[PDB]
Amino acid sequence: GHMKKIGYVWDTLYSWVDTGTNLSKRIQPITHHMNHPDTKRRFNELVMTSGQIDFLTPIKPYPATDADILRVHDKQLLDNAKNVSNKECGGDIGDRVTHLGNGGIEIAYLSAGGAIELTKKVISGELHTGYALVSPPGHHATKKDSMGFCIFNNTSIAAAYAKDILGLKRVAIVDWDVHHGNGTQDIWWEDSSVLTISIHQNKCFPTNSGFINERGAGNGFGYNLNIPLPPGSGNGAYIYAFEKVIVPALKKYEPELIIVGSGFDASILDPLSRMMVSSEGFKKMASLILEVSNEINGGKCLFVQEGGYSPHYLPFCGLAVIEALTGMHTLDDPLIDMVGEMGGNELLPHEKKVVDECANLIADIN
Amino acid sequence: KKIGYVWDTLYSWVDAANLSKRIQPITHHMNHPDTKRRFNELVMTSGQIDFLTPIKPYPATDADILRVHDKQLLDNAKNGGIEIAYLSAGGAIELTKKVISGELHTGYALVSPPGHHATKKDSMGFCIFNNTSIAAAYAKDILGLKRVAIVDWDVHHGNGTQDIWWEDSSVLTISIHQNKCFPTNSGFINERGAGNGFGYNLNIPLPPGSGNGAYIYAFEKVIVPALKKYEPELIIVGSGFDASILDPLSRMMVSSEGFKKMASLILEVSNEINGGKCLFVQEGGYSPHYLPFCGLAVIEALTGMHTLDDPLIDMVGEMGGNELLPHEKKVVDECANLIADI
Amino acid sequence: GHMKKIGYVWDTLYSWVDTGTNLSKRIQPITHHMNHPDTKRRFNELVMTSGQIDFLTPIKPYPATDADILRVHDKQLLDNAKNVSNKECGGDIGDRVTHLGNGGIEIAYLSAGGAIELTKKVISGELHTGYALVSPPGHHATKKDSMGFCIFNNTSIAAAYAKDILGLKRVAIVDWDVHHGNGTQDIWWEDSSVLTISIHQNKCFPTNSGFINERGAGNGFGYNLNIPLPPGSGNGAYIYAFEKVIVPALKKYEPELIIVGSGFDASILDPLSRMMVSSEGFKKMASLILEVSNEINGGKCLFVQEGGYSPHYLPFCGLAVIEALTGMHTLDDPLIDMVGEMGGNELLPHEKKVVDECANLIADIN
Amino acid sequence: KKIGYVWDTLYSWVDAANLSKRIQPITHHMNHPDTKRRFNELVMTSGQIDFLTPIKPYPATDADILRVHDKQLLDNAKNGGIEIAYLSAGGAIELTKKVISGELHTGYALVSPPGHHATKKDSMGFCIFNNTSIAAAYAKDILGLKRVAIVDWDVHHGNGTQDIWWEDSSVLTISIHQNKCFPTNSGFINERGAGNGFGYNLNIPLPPGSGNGAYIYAFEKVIVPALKKYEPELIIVGSGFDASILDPLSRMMVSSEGFKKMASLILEVSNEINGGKCLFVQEGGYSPHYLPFCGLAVIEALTGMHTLDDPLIDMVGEMGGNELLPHEKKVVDECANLIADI
Ligand SMILES: O=C(CCCCCCNC(=O)c1cnc(N(c2ccccc2)c2ccccc2Cl)nc1)NO
Ligand SMILES: O=C(CCCCCCNC(=O)c1cnc(N(c2ccccc2)c2ccccc2Cl)nc1)NO
Ligand SMILES: O=C(CCCCCCNC(=O)c1cnc(N(c2ccccc2)c2ccccc2Cl)nc1)NO
Ligand SMILES: O=C(CCCCCCNC(=O)c1cnc(N(c2ccccc2)c2ccccc2Cl)nc1)NO
Ligand SMILES: [K+]
Ligand SMILES: [K+]
Ligand SMILES: [K+]
Ligand SMILES: [K+]
Ligand SMILES: [K+]
Ligand SMILES: [K+]
Ligand SMILES: [K+]
Ligand SMILES: [K+]
Ligand SMILES: [Zn+2]
Ligand SMILES: [Zn+2]
Ligand SMILES: [Zn+2]
Numbered sequence A, C: 001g002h003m004k005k006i007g008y009v010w011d012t013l014y015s016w017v018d019t020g021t022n023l024s025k026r027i028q029p030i031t032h033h034m035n036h037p038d039t040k041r042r043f044n045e046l047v048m049t050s051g052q053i054d055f056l057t058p059i060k061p062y063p064a065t066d067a068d069i070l071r072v073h074d075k076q077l078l079d080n081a082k083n084v085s086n087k088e089c090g091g092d093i094g095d096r097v098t099h100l101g102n103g104g105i106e107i108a109y110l111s112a113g114g115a116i117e118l119t120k121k122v123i124s125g126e127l128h129t130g131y132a133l134v135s136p137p138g139h140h141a142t143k144k145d146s147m148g149f150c151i152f153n154n155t156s157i158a159a160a161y162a163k164d165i166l167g168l169k170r171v172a173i174v175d176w177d178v179h180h181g182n183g184t185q186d187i188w189w190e191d192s193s194v195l196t197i198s199i200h201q202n203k204c205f206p207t208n209s210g211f212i213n214e215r216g217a218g219n220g221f222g223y224n225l226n227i228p229l230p231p232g233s234g235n236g237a238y239i240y241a242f243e244k245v246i247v248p249a250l251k252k253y254e255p256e257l258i259i260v261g262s263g264f265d266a267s268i269l270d271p272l273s274r275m276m277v278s279s280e281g282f283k284k285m286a287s288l289i290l291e292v293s294n295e296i297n298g299g300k301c302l303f304v305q306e307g308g309y310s311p312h313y314l315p316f317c318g319l320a321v322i323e324a325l326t327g328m329h330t331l332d333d334p335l336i337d338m339v340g341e342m343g344g345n346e347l348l349p350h351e352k353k354v355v356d357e358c359a360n361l362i363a364d365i366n
Numbered sequence B, D: 001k002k003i004g005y006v007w008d009t010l011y012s013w014v015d016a017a018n019l020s021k022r023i024q025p026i027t028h029h030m031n032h033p034d035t036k037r038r039f040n041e042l043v044m045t046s047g048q049i050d051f052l053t054p055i056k057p058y059p060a061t062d063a064d065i066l067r068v069h070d071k072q073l074l075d076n077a078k079n080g081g082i083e084i085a086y087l088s089a090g091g092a093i094e095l096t097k098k099v100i101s102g103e104l105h106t107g108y109a110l111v112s113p114p115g116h117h118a119t120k121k122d123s124m125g126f127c128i129f130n131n132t133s134i135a136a137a138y139a140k141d142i143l144g145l146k147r148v149a150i151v152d153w154d155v156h157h158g159n160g161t162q163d164i165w166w167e168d169s170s171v172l173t174i175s176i177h178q179n180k181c182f183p184t185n186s187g188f189i190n191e192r193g194a195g196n197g198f199g200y201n202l203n204i205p206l207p208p209g210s211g212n213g214a215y216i217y218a219f220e221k222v223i224v225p226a227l228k229k230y231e232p233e234l235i236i237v238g239s240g241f242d243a244s245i246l247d248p249l250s251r252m253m254v255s256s257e258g259f260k261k262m263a264s265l266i267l268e269v270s271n272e273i274n275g276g277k278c279l280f281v282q283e284g285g286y287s288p289h290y291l292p293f294c295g296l297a298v299i300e301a302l303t304g305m306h307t308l309d310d311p312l313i314d315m316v317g318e319m320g321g322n323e324l325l326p327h328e329k330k331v332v333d334e335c336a337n338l339i340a341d342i
C-alpha cells in the first residue's frame, strides 16, 4: 500500500481488570488501588480525544492460546492462573499484590494476544510499527511465577511467538518500565537468541535484582544487560543511557525485531519510582528506538505497555510516544514548562558513572 | 504525660481541568482529605490516642491572620471554606498557647489546610493562611516571646514563611526541601534574609533521590546546631510527609523511621535548650498508603509508645536512600557554613 | 445495501464531562457526584465487551452548530453557556446542579450533534434505527434555561433539524426518562408539528411540572401528553402505559419520525426515582416503539440517551434496549431473577387509573 | 442530660464481579464506609456531639454471640474483619448496659457492620452477627430482663431477628419494611412466630412508594399500640435509613422529618411505659448525600436540640409520599389486627 501504517492495539477488556482485594496491623483498607484501570484508560482516552487515533491503524487483539503461554511459562504457572480465575471471588496469585477477578484470566490471555497480534502484523509488513496498550502487564512474570501485577510475560510470549512461528532467530526486548524486568531476564537467562535489556531505578522493584553483574549464563552470558540508574535520574541520564548503551548494544546484536516494554512509571509524578522523566524524555526514548530499528532491521519494532501509575501525567507521557510513532504532534504536554525546571534534564556524575560501566558490557554482545 | 493532639472533623471537610488542552477531569484531586484523614484514624485505631491529650481548636481571628498577612490576602480569602482556614490556624495557636503555658510539653496539630506557601501577600499551593507563622506571631505578640524558630521539613520550600520573616531576626526560619520542587524558582541557599533578618533564613535544598541518610545528616549537621546557636524560646515544626518514599509530589526517599528520627532530634534539642517547648503542625503529604505510618512514627516519638510496626520497614530498608551520598553531603556541608551568621 | 444497519453514536468526549464543583449548612463535600461519567461509560463499555458492537454501525458525531442550537433555544441561553465554558474553572449554569468544565461547551455541541447525525442517517435510509449514547442530556433544557444537567435539548434540536433541513412535517418525541421532560414540553408547547410525550414519576423532577392537564396551548393544544405514574410503578404500569397510551397516540398522530428520549433512571436501582423498571421492561418499551414505527412510518425511529444513575444496573438496562434494536440477545441480565420477584411487574389499580385518564387525551390528537 | 453515642473509628474500617457474565468490576461498593462515616462526621460538625455522652464500645465475647448464634456461624466467621464484628455487637451491648443501669436515659449506637439479617445459623446481607438480638439476649440473660422489644425500621426485612426469637415470646420482634425488597421471599404478615412465640413476631410489609404518611400511620396504629400491649422492659430499635427517598436499595420516600417523628414516637411511648429505656442501633442505609441528615434528625430527637436544617426539606416535601394512600393504609390496618394476639 501507499499509506503510513502505525498500529494501535486496545480493547475495552483491558480496562476491566479487577484490582480489588490487614486489620491486625492497622492497615486501613484502600478503595482505589495502585493499579486501578483509570490510569491506562486515561491514556487510551487521550489517544482518542487528541486526534492521534486518526493517524493510527486499530488492531483487534485475539486471545493468546495456552500453547503461546507455555512457550515461556511453566504449566504450573498457567494451572495456578486458571485455578484462581475460576474462584467465585477470584483471588491473589503469585505474590501479595497480583490479583485476578473471577474470569480475569481472559484479560491476561487477551493482553498477551495483543502483543502477539502487533508482532505478527509488524513482521509481516502490514504495519511499520505500533503500540499495544495492553493490561495486565508482563515483565515480572518469570518461568515459574506471576508477580508484580503480571500474570503472563507479554513481551516474552511475543518474542517466543516471533521465533517459533514467524522464523526469527534474534529478538531484543528493551524494557524501560522503571522497575526491573526480572521475569524477562529469567525467561531468556540462558538464551542468546533474545537480548534482554532493562533500564530501571536501582533496587526499586524487585529490591533484590536488576544489578549490573546479572548478565545471563551459559549460551546466554552477555545477552542480558541491566542499567540500574540512581533515584532522581531524569531525561539526562535516560537519554544518555539510550545513546551510550542501549542503541550501541542493539546495533551490535542486530536483532530482527525490537520489542519495547513501555512503562511510564519513570515519570516525574509516578508514586512507584523516584525518577524524573518527562514526556519529552519518553518521546526521545521512543524516537531513538525507531531510528536504530530503521537503521538495522528496516523498522521492525513495536511497543507494549508495562507499568505506570500517574493518572494526571501518564496519558501525556504515553501520547508523546504515540506522537513519536505517528509523526503528528497534535497536542502539547501541559506540564512541560513546570516539569522542565525541576531538575533531571542534566546528566549527573553518579548517573554517568553507572551508564559508562554498563557501556563496558557491549563488548560481550555478539 | 501531656502530649497534645489537635484534630477537628472539619479539617477533613476541605472541598483545573481544561478541555481544549485535552486535560481530562480528575475526580479524586491531589489534596483530597483522605490522606490526612487516614493519619487521624490511625492515631485512633493504633491506641496512640490513649497517650495523647485532645486539644479543641478554636477559630483564629482576623487580627491573628493580620499579624503576618496583608488585608488584601484576607479580603481575597473572604471574597464558605474560609471557616476551615480559620480553624486550622486556630489549632496551631491553641497548641502554641498550651505548650508555652506549661499545660502541655509538646504535641501535634493535625490541621488542614496547610500553610507554609502563604506569603504576606498571597495564598498559594493549597495554603490559605500561614499557620505556623500565625502561631509564631501569636507567641511573640501576645505571649511575649522574643525568639521563635520555625523548622519546615515538608518536602517543598516554605516560601511563604521565608517571605513573612524575611527582614526579621526574631523568627529563625529553616526549610529543608527538595531543590527546585515547589515553587520551582525558590529555596536556594543564597536566600538568607535581608536587613536585620540577614542570616536568619536558612534553606537546605537537597537533591532529588535523597533519603534518610541525607535528611538525618542535615538535621544533625545543620538544623540542630543552628537551633542551639539561635536559642529559640519556642520551636514550631512545619511537619509535612511528602518527602516519603511513596509521595507523588517529590522524589525523596524518607521512611517512617526517618521521620521518627527527625522528630526525635527536634524534641531532644528542645528538651536541652528551651524546656522542650516545641510543637508540630501538619503541612503537606499525599500518600494515602504510607503517610499515616509516617505521621504515627512522629506521634510515637512524642509519646514514647511504640504500639505498631511500619508494614514497609523491610521493603524500603532495601531500596536505598539510607546511605549519605557525596552530592548530598556537599549540599549539607555548604548549608552548615551558614550557621556562623546566626 | 443488503446489511441490517443499526447505528451506534458514541464519542470518548461524552465521558469527559466535568461533574465537579455548602459548609455553613454542614453539607459535607461529595467527591463522586451523582452525574459522574462512570454510569454511562459502563454502558458504552458493556456494548463493547458484550459483543453487541459487532452488530452495530458506529456513527461518528459531529458538533452541532450555533444555528442548530438557536432553532430551539434563546441566544441568551447559548451566550450563557459560552460564557461559563470560557471561565478558567468553568462553573454552574442555569440552576444549582448543572455544571460546565472549562471548555465543556464542546461536549454539549457534540452531544446535540450526535443526535443530529443519527437523525440524518435514519431519515436518509442509511440506517434503519439506532442509539445515540450522548452526554450531557437534554430534556430539561427549555427555550430559555439550561437545567437538570442539561445544557441543550438534544432531542428537540434533532427534531427541529429534521423539520427545517430534512423536510419533515410531523415528529414525535417520546421521553421515558423517569423525570419530566419539561424542556421539550416548553419548546414545542404551542406547536402541533412536534408531538411531545413524557412518561415519568409524578412530582419527581421538576417537582412542579409533568401533570396530566399540561396539554399545550394554541395550535399546540392536545399535542403534549404527560403520563405521571405513581412512585413504585414498574414493568406492569410502564408496559400498560405504552400499550394503552403511547402506541395509540403515535398511531393517531402519524409522525414521520419518532425520537425517543431514553433514560434508565426508572430502573429499580436508580437513586433518583422510586420506580421499579427492569431490563426486561426497557426491552419491551423499546420493542413497542420499534414495532409501531415499522407500522406507521417504515421504522423511522431512534433513541437518544437521557438520564440514569445506577452504575451496577444501567449498563444492563441500556444493553437490553440495544439488543432489542439488533435482534441479537448475547448476554443475560444477571439481576433478572432477583429484581423480578421484588414487585412492579403487576399493574396496580392506582397505576391503571392514571394511565386510563391519560388514554382519554388521545381523542384530541389529530 | 444523658444521651449516649457509640462510635469507634474501626466501624469505618470495614473492608462479586464476574467477567464471563460481563459484570464490570465496581470500585466503590454498595456498603462502602463513607455513608455511615458521613453520619458520624455530621454528628460532630453540627455540634450535636456537645449534647451527647460518648460511649466507648468493647468487644463482644464469643459467649455474647453464642447466646443467639450457633457455633457453626461463629466458626464460619472466624475461619481479620471479625474484630469489627465483635466491636459492633459490643457497642450495642455497651449502650444496653448503660441504659438499663440508669447511667444513660437513651442513646444511639452508630455501629458497623449491621446485624438484622444474621439468623441463628447464617450471616448474610452485610450482617455477620445480629447486634440487636445479641444486646437483647444480654439484657435478658445477664441483666435479668423478662421482656424485650426489637423494633426494626431498616427498609429491609429483619429475617435474622425474626428467626432468632421465632419460638420466644420474651422478645417481641417487629419489622417494618418494603414488601419483598430483601430478602425477596420473607417478611409477610403471616410470619407470626411459632409455639410459645406465636403472636410475638409482627411484620409490616409496606408497598413500594410508601413515604412519611404510611410510616407514621404504621407507627401510630400498629407499632406503638403493640408496644403498649407487650409492655417491654427495654426497647431496642434497629435504625436503618435505607427507607429514605434517595436510597438506591429501596423504593420508599421517608424524609429526615419522617425518621425524626418515628424516633419521637418510640421515645414517647418508652417514656410512658418503661421509664424511657430505649436505644437505637444502626442498621442499613446507602445514600451518602441524605443518610447523614436522616441520622442527625434521629439524634436531634434524642437530644432535643435542633441545630441544623435538612437542606432537602422543601424538595422532598413536594415529592409526595406524605399522603397516606388507600393501598398503604389497608396493609397497616391488616397488621393492626395482629395486636390482639400480643
Ligand atoms: O509497575 C510495576 C509494579 C510492580 C509491583 C509493585 C508493587 C506495588 N505495591 C502495592 O501496590 C501495594 C503493596 N502493599 C500495600 N499495602 C501493604 C503493605 C505491606 C503489608 C500489607 C499491606 C497497603 C495496603 C493498604 C494500605 C496501606 C498499605 Cl502500605 N499496598 C499497595 N512493575 O513494573
Ligand atoms: O505539599 C505541597 C503542595 C503545594 C502545591 C503543589 C502543586 C500541586 N499541583 C496540583 O495538584 C495539580 C496541578 N495541575 C494539575 N493539572 C493541570 C496541569 C497543567 C495545566 C492544567 C491542569 C491537571 C488537572 C487535571 C488532570 C490532569 C492534570 Cl495534569 N493537576 C494537579 N506544598 O508544601
Ligand atoms: O436525570 C435527570 C436529573 C435531573 C437533575 C436532578 C438533580 C439531582 N440533584 C443532585 O445531583 C444534587 C442536588 N443537591 C445536592 N446537595 C445539596 C442539596 C441541597 C442544598 C445544597 C446541596 C448535596 C451536596 C452534597 C452533599 C449532600 C447534598 Cl444533599 N446534591 C446533589 N433528569 O432527567
Ligand atoms: O441494608 C441491607 C442490605 C442487605 C443486602 C442487600 C444486597 C445488596 N446487594 C449488593 O450489594 C450487590 C449484589 N450484587 C452485585 N452485582 C452482581 C449481581 C448479580 C450477579 C453478580 C454480581 C454486581 C457486582 C459488580 C457490578 C455490578 C453488579 Cl450488578 N452488586 C452489588 N439490609 O438491611
Ligand atoms: K538473554
Ligand atoms: K525496566
Ligand atoms: K527570618
Ligand atoms: K520545607
Ligand atoms: K407539542
Ligand atoms: K420522561
Ligand atoms: K419473638
Ligand atoms: K425492617
Ligand atoms: Zn513498573
Ligand atoms: Zn509539601
Ligand atoms: Zn432523568
Ligand SMILES: [Zn+2]
Pocket (backbone or CB within 6 Å): D154, D155, D156, D240, D242, D283, D284, D285
Ligand atoms: Zn437495610
